[model samples]
Target: GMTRTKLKLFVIGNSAISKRAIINLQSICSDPKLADLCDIEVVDLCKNKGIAEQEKILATPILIKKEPLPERRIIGDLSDKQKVISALEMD
Candidate 1:
């Protein structure tokens, strides 16, 4: 099937928590329904400080929905799957 909607999600961080966030995102991205509908990127602030500066990222482990209009940001370790799904409107 073709994806009708597209999503671009960026996860930025540089720590253990950040890794966990990326893992969580991977889990979400693996969902059969959204498997081919989302693009998730993990950016390590330590390696790419310039991007952090450009994006004005003030905290680690921040997830940003960069596409689909009305961009949204979530600050956390992404440990709560339910919250993440609700926030991303994946339900």
Candidate 2:
């Protein structure tokens, strides 16, 4: 069985932010421990622009936690390690 957390990250920008998000997410995904235990979906607003509105995205590089209770949003490039961990704590 897959024992992990499901993560959907919404990227609502058409710039370096989106790229950075992918890179950051890849880093997390590359982690041997987390890689198997998590799934990340990155949505590009430039192509799927409507997803932004569907998710009520007000900014780019927004990371939303939709499942596992107390859904939360981290609006910005994933630069703050502490903040990122804090968001995950909601699960």
Candidate 3:
């Protein structure tokens, strides 16, 4: 059997902060061996627009952990390495 973590990242535009969130999210996942385990889903607010409404997203550059039952959410550029590790932690 294989393991996987369903990660949903929501954002709009290609700003520096947005790009950092994208980069930081992946690095943490890859840094501790969650690379292969992470199933990243990017929801473009500009393109899909409604996903934001549907998901009730109020903030930009939000990272959502949608797997393993309980859901986890984090907003911002994902710069706090320790913070991300704590939020994205799983079984």
TM-score of each: 0.73, 0.74, 0.84
lDDT of each: 0.67, 0.70, 0.79
Query: Model 1, range 1-91, lDDT digits (tens) per residue?
Result: 6543344334543557767887787787778775356777677666664787676678767777665556666777788877877786666
Give the per-residue lDDT digits (tens) of candidate 3, residues 1-91: 5667888888788889889888887777776554447788777788885788777799999988888557888888999878875776753
Candidate 1 local lDDT, residue 87: 82
Q: Which pairs of residues clash in candidate 2, taking residues 3 or more apart in a chain or in different chains?
A: none
Clashes of 2: 0
Report the lDDT tens digits of candidate 2 across residue range 44-83.
Answer: 7777857878888888788876655566778777866567
Clashing pairs in 1: none
The prediction achieving the highest TM-score against the true structure is 3
In candidate 1, stretches whose alpha carbon ends up further than 4 angstroms from where it belongs are 1-14, 34-36
TM-score ranking from best candidate downward:
3, 2, 1
Q: Between prediction 2 and prediction 3, which has the larger lDDT?
A: 3
The most accurate candidate by lDDT is: 3
